[PDB]
Amino acid sequence: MNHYVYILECKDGSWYTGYTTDVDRRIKKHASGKGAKYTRGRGPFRLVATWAFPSKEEAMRWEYEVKHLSRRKKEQLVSLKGGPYENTTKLSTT
């Protein structure tokens, strides 16, 4: 199965942790791509980062541990990878 841990920054500033596991999203994108463009989204879910694990236990333990750790370590987790520079959204850079 496909284990993707997504962390979304909510309207409040709290990071929403949860890993998804459905093949449907993958095939859906390919099916939709036939006569469609990449552009799709609005908010208010801000994607900070995405962690993909081919391993069952790693996906379960990662989720479980981010649920385990406090805010301070939750911040540190993003400080390891997820930094504003890694967002590469736009800001003002051409």
What characteristics describe this protein?
94 residues, alpha+beta, GIY-YIG endonuclease, three-stranded antiparallel sheet, 3 strands, globular, UPF0213 protein BH0048, UPF0213_domain, GIY-YIG_endonuc, GIY-YIG_endonuc_sf, structural genomics, unknown function
Would you state the CATH class? Alpha Beta
**Integer-rounded radius of gyration:** 15 Å
Number of domains: 1
* N to C succession of SSEs: EEHEHHH
Largest sheet: 3 strands, antiparallel
**Would you report the number of β strands?**
3
- Tally of alpha and pi helices: 4
Describe this entry's structure for a reader.
It contains 4 helices and 3 strands. It is of the alpha+beta class. It has one domain: 3-Layer(aba) Sandwich (GIY-YIG endonuclease). The protein has a 3-stranded antiparallel beta sheet, with helices on one face. It is globular and about 45 Å long. 4% of the residues are buried. The PDB classes it as structural genomics, unknown function. Keywords: BhR2, Autostructure, Northeast Structural Genomics Consortium, PSI, Protein Structure Initiative, nesg, structural genomics, unknown function. It forms a monomeric assembly. The entry is titled "Solution NMR structure of the UPF0213 protein BH0048 from Bacillus halodurans. Northeast Structural Genomics target BhR2".
